[PDB]
């Protein structure tokens, strides 16, 4: 249904035929980032629930794959599977905990 990620389509009648107006989403203005498969925190490997880990050079974030929206790496958007000894390419970074300021205050 068109070139790109298909959103919707509109039919138009034509003599002996149909013309489809395919409305698609095309990514643009891509930017390079340093990526890692997992984040090693406290001896545990954290993997993104729905996104991908990206780094702008100094800080690590997790973002959705098809649009750049960097977010802080927390336990809400990552899941823990295993220790840090198996994943090839795992990098060391902190993983924030939302409950940590709550019980502290």
Ligand X SMILES: *[C@@H]1O[C@H](CO)[C@@H](O[C@@H]2O[C@H](CO)[C@@H](O)[C@H](O)[C@H]2NC(C)=O)[C@H](O)[C@H]1NC(C)=O
Q: How distant, in Å, are the alpha carbons of 3, 87, 89 from that of 45?
A: 37, 8, 11
Report the distance separating Cα 1 and Cα 49, nearest Å. Answer: 29
Indicate whether 72 belongs to the interface with another protein (CB under 8 A).
no
Nearest to 43 by CA among 104, 86, 72: 86
Q: Residue 73: which of ligand X, another protein, none does it interact with, CB under 5 to 8 A by kind? A: none
DSSP, residue by residue, 77-95: SEEE-S-TTSSTT-EE---
Residue 98 binds which entry of another protein, ligand X, none, CB below 5-8 Å type-dependent: none
Residues 19-58 that bind another protein (CB under 8 A): 19-38, 45, 47-48, 52, 54
Task: State the residues that interact with another protein by CB under 8 A.
Answer: 2-5, 7, 14, 16-38, 45, 47-48, 52, 54, 63, 65-68, 79, 81-82, 86-89
Task: State the residues that interact with ligand X by CB under 6 A.
Answer: 29-32, 40, 56-59, 92
């Amino acid at each position: 249904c068109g070139k790109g990620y298909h959103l919707m389509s509109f039919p138009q009648s034509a003599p002996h035929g149909v013309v489809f107006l395919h409305v698609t989403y095309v990514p643009a203005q891509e930017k390079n980032f340093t990526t890692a498969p997992a984040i090693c925190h406290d001896g545990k490997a954290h993997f993104p629930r729905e996104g991908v880990f990206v780094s702008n050079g100094t800080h690590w974030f997790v973002t959705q794959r098809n649009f750049y929206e960097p977010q802080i790496i927390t336990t809400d958007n990552t899941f823990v599977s295993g220790n840090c000894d198996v994943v090839i390419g795992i990098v060391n970074n902190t993983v924030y905990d939302p409950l940590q300021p709550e019980l502290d205050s």
